[PDB]
Amino acid sequence: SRRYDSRTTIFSPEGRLYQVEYAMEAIGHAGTCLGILANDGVLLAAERRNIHKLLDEVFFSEKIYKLNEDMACSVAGITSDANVLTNELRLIAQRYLLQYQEPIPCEQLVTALCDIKQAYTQFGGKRPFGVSLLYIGWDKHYGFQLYQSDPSGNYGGWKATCIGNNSAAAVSMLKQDYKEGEMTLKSALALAIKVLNKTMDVSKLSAEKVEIATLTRENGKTVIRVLKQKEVEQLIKKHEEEEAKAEREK
Amino acid sequence: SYDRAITVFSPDGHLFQVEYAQEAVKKGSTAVGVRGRDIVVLGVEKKSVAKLQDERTVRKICALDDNVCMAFAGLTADARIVINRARVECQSHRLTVEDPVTVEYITRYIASLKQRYTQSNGRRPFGISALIVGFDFDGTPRLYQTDPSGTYHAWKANAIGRGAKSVREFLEKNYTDEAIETDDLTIKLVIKALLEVVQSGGKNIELAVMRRDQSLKILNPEEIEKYVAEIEKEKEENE
Amino acid sequence: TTIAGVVYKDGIVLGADTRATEGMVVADKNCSKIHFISPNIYCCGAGTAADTDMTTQLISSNLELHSLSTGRLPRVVTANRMLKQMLFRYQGYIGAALVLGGVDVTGPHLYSIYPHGSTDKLPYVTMGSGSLAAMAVFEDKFRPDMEEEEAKNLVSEAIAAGIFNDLGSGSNIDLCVISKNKLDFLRPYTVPNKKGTRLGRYRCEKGTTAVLTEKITPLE
Amino acid sequence: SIMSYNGGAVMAMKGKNCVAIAADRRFGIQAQMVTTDFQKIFPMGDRLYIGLAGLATDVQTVAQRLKFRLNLYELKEGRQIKPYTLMSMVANLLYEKRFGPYYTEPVIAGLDPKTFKPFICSLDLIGCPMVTDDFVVSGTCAEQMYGMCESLWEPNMDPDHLFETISQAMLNAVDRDAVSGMGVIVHIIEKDKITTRTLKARMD
Amino acid sequence: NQYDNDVTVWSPQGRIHQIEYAMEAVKQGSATVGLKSKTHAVLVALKRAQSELAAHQKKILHVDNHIGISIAGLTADARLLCNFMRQECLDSRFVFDRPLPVSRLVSLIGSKTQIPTQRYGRRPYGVGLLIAGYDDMGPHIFQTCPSANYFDCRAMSIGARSQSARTYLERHMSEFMECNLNELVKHGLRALRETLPAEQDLTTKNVSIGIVGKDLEFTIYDDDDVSPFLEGLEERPQ
Amino acid sequence: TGYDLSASTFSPDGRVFQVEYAMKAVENSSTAIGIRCKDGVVFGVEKLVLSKLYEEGSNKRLFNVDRHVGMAVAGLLADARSLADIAREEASNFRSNFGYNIPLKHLADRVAMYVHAYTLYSAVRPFGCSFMLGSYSVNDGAQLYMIDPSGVSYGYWGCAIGKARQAAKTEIEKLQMKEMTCRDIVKEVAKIIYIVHDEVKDKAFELELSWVGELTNGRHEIVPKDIREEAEKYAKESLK
Amino acid sequence: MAERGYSFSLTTFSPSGKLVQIEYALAAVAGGAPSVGIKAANGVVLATEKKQKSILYDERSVHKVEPITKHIGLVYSGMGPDYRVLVHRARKLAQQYYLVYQEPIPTAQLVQRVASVMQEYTQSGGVRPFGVSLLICGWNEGRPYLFQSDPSGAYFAWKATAMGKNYVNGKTFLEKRYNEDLELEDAIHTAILTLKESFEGQMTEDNIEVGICNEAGFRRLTPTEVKDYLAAIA
Amino acid sequence: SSAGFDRHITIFSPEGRLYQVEYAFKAINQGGLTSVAVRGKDCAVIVTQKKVPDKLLDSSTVTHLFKITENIGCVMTGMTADSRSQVQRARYEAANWKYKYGYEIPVDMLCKRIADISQVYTQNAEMRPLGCCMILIGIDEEQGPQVYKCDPAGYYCGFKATAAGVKQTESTSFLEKKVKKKFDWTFEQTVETAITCLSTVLSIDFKPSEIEVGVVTVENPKFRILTEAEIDAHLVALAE
């Protein structure tokens, strides 16, 4: 019946879509997800949340998912919506591989999910998918690429971006310290740790609290390795060493 | 599926939802289109480059077919669906009634899709008004504008987006008989309209002009800067 | 295929041969024709190997789901009614002839299910290509109420007649004995026929074949 | 025979810790050869290979359809597919089309993902699985292949011996079939490495 | 107030409000009068013109040779029902090779009208009809309300100012059975004259007369054809 | 209020108000009474004539649902005509599917289940009618059932529906229904209706009477005009 | 007569951006009777407290701990009827995997598939979100796995967890113990103790229902075994 | 606590409570009736109060006890039409179980299936939750006599003895004390315990006609509805 109905897709008198804006707020509450692009490789690092001692941690990184051999994504937002979208992304990549026997390029995957996300806003009187995800991938057509998809269905190709709780602060640090045309994944990894230390209120950036995954092309194979906690620990110490060196300068 | 009319006439006799959809176009980034004697030209503003962001992904000018091209102002996501739907119709028009697609036909198709969303139950109207610029078999350059409601009007020159009214007034006042001509002058007229755009960044404004006998070419940023320099030289001449 | 079943005092012993022949060549020398419908019920299948294997799995799945909801051991009537209704719907297109035997609360039961959807409940049933031969053993040597050993000997003898008297049937004899207190499956219950040893060595020494091109891929 | 229209032959064998898959390379329509490099053994992962022989349209469609399913399974469950699991997955694909069967008879020959015990399996067009501990042959020259395999196989063979035994069996058998031949490719899988070789063959 | 919005909702007084509102639509409509005699049935209607240049909208619509329907309500609704009635008469002629009995058609019309007045979303049909017919039983006139209740009436009137027509028809109802076609139309046009505001008068342009009888297939006499029926009338008693 | 908008809503008290409002419409309807005699059932309906111009038989509230079954309706006439059509159809399906005339007990239950379905959902309004079904069979004997808008079907030796339901049942209880012959019962039905008519609250009414019984050979039929009229004469004489 | 029914989601985003109806369903899980799940190195232990209101009710007829499959079992906190609908659905999903792959469903896979059904209710129209949170346990590849699925459909893997009344106190009580070096499932005693901490009048074989999944499989402990464990419970 | 239409439709409320389902429980009590069931060592007995408000209603038609299957019987407490519909759904599900599975439905399963139908009514709006509670009696081999109750909310459990209707807190307590010291009741004792519990809670000391008793026994599995005379002999025995 009309009385028990939520408009969901109806336009505001202002002209904005109210539900989509509300969904964006949910992404803001979710944990920090940050991506930095370097010429050698593209990396996605996200902050683990609700790290209670009893959790098994057997999911091989809850935030990070591998959509295809050459593509990966991390999502901030309602977990249930994320699981539905991550499965859909994997199917779209596979369906392309069968129709044309070549891996999906990247923007095509982002646009295809984005088309679904917009469709929910467009019609059906149904709740929008309140999830925002960053896509890191390599393609023959345009090399390493990074993309961000909003709940609205609009997408972007940012070389460096953050979609988590402290996104405004992370982007400001990224804009100032990202060196365009300078690669070195190691420099990008250090920048990521510094952004994470600012974004995370908890000090010391504990290795368990953060997850880091790096996509690099080796021997023409594209390897989405996930950094081990020991690798994360050495990186945090390196950030501390730089902070200590600044203290020595002071 | 959901079967209730999203847009219903209000007592004043106006479809309120369609007016709200137009408001989304008003909030959209400004887009300017002019038709040259032989070269059709269209331009976009408010690139708002964040340095980290990549421009190719955010481009707001696309070629539906070799003959036609489009620019959009309004909700970005809605446009991506309408552009891809037009691309399918243009190729489908070739499979049936074999021949190229006339610019007027593609604008009627985009208008009919937009009207159908207003006249359909359960679906919110598209939030995009579009400038479709193309050359027909006769070679006459044609530019058309599609409202969110779904009305298409041929326009020799027009602009849509934030501060559309100011640019539209500037375009009619600055419009020159012979369409400026010389190709560069027609591009300059858009560059002058781009200067009339509030940002007036220079590099920030990006425009693409179709020869209308060949294929759409995006102006190189350095090439656009040289055209902006021509406008700056004209400003020095005015001084 | 010779598939034979007998109801003996306590329970049902189900026996089948172990050969699958595509055309007139033996594709499989050890194909299991006795299938696990449930803990208390087992089935023997002769017909299209794909149809027999798939039809059995669906019933086993539905019975396992039924047993979890019911909370009690499934009845052979349930399996048979489920199998007959599926086979009738397919109108003979699903070609599986199934001997269903299980011990339930009611007692030991044996049913013969034919592809068109007809089932007969009988003390002794034989189905398959070697079925006529096994039925001759059953008619001559079946006595109502038999000890487990006497029934096991009868089922093996029935299968052996099919193995040695039908080109289609062959290989080892497999027997599964089901009783209220115990379920025993002997996959190689008897091995009547064995391949003879090879008199002459035919091994080919390395370098007896020519390689036009070779590549090596390191793994992990 | 739809099966003999394009021709084909596949054979797999079991060794001490290795599994070998082989196929004829000829692709042809009726009696006219078209190409000598058709791929009939498609890798289904590291240490697992599937060989499809039958109508070439089906050989390609099934390998492509199987890869679509395997890739989704490998993403949804991190572990690489177990050889037994893949056989069930193919049988589900083949049975879904039981009324109109894909005209292919796949042979799967791969080592286990965590433990490394050789697995060789052969399937019918409808989808009946046939795990074996010796050899599986699924081709137009099935009978000729079976005779050589029965008379040449030995219970435990080092990778070198398994290669000679599969090589001679495919080469001698393919020679007596007119619609199959034009070269043989042997992929022998051992835990340390995968070795692919092409054997000298009568191109007649 | 809340109860008035839908047909599905029932008032605390147990009356369906939307049905009553649909009933009003018939009242805001041109007046029509139906009478019957032993052998013939006449359905005079008062056509109303939006503008002097504009032609009067047609009220009597032929359904089949034996049946004609007047309309007093939303025109588009009448067309949907009139299309159904033409189809129903056609199917009866096609399968049974006989004219559909008029009463049986009225019964089908009610069942179609009841289904919207019940189901959610669908709106009550809002047209009042005065069907006229001849069958083995004889001449018939049937009134249908938006409530889906049919009513078999020897005479009838529906629409604005119809009450005056009902009073005249009731006073002279006895005379109707024993009269010729001219008299039956003459009583019926006199009834329309009562519905007409006194200043306005019956004219060939504003009156449509439809007659079905034992020897007459439904004929919508109008314009000049209406003039002989109009002639011989006593002057309006204003 | 605010819990009475839909029939898919239960009041905090624990009732579906929409069904109750539907029953109110039945109360607004004029009375129809049915009595089970020794050999058959007789139904009489008080239908007041709103307009003299109606030719009689207009809006008839007695319907021959099946050869052996007949119904008397009180409530919105439009809702009733639909219910009679469901009843006529349910009877026809039984004769085609099982080969014999439907037992009245089954017909009342099947129609009642349909009436019940409307109450459960917000989409469809509850029915506004409370018809009574009566049948005579040599094998099963005379049976009378009344189904109300809620969907409740109860067998009644005597029953009334409408504004004068209480007055009619009280007058009905005095009659010896179990032993009275059906022809004798008709005069009584006419008397009960004439007493409960109200005289000035409603305008002049026409008495519609139906007979199902051994006299009618198990076929529901309208009372013959000669049997009627004399019944009206007794009713007018009895009231005065 | 209304056919499929409402097609519009009853759950919609708040101005804050948190779905209100899912939060209300969480309240039913917290309001639910206490349920405790502990995973020991050999096997998972699932314990829930069933206190029937009266002696009249037969405790044996209904089991709060249920076997989804031979190696997978489920315990619930929240509305009872909804748990039965999920349990039937989970058994169907587990059997469908077995039919397709001929291998018992991996424990994690059942959770994702059950969770996807739970998420469907939140997005889909007409249906209210489920009011039940489950603590699925399984023994695949030897290692025991314990997972919890919330009404929203988010699934988390827990070595130990508790849901229902006084869940927070239960979580702290487990935090004090749950060293997770218990090779044997002596955690059956700890699970009895955690339920005991929030237990009401007494703990009896009838009062507590315990199901253990080990290498052998998921077996609901017999009432006599629960009595033996309840007896001499420290 | 109220949010939006939480109390107007079957949607969750603050505190995770389905108000509409709680209102449905009140509906069972709305009908002025009570029913009690007792499970003995060898038999299970169901008793209900039959109130015929007016003599005209046929006593036989007014029954709240129905036969789901030859070996299974039920007592319905709640709105009559809704209860009659649940009876038909249960009868159909048992017929399907026999046809599909080949054995008569276990009484435990019939309850779960009717309960599962009820839970969906709560889950999906557009369907009212239902206002009837059903108690089922049957003999199951290896389970002895069994009594089961299905709530409108979809809850189901096995019941040694139970009651539903207007006065059930009193009925459960009176039975609970008797259950504590029952020591396995015999068939006469089970009928006596049920009749006495109803007699005391209603405080009516009802005569045989006023109540209906249906019993299922290990010796006679078929569900049987006791005739009034048979009820009277038990009724006098408790009276002594």
Ligand SMILES: CC(C)C[C@@H](C=O)NC(=O)[C@H](CC(C)C)NC(=O)[C@H](CC(C)C)NC(=O)OCc1ccccc1
């Ligand atoms: C359980 C079975 C192994 C029983 C066995 C014997 O009856 N069945 C069979 O042998 C039947 C053929 C038979 C009906 C003549 N099936 C077979 O021989 C083979 C199985 C081996 C090749 C591995 N399956 C098969 O594909 O049959 C060919 C075929 C193809 C299409 C339709 C029908 C039959």
